[PDB]
Backbone:
């Protein structure tokens, strides 16, 4: 594709274009993921 | 300087005065949970 768009040359990005007029199951969701590690270690982080 | 059980231990002492005479104990200063392997220093 020599670095130009065309047939079978699609940019692997797509936009969202969020608007307040969409349906309930369409607005973006802010997501976080917390991962722990249950092993034998100095155990730096501990709860209250 | 000591390194045991995944902890680095540093004891320290200061005095204003070849090594002198007398007795003076060293008080604990810092403990650190680093957990590395130590073989040489500089």
Residues:
């Amino acid at each position: 594709c020599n670095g130009v768009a065309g047939f079978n040359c699609y940019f692997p990005l797509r936009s969202y274009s969020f608007r307040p007029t969409y349906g309930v199951g369409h607005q973006p969701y802010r997501v976080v993921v917390l991962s722990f590690e249950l092993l034998h270690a100095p155990a730096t982080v501990c709860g209250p | 300087f000591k390194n045991i059980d995944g902890y680095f231990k540093i004891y320290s002492k200061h005095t204003p005065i070849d090594l002198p005479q007398g007795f003076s104990a060293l008080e604990p200063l810092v403990d650190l949970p680093i957990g590395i392997n130590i073989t040489r220093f500089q």
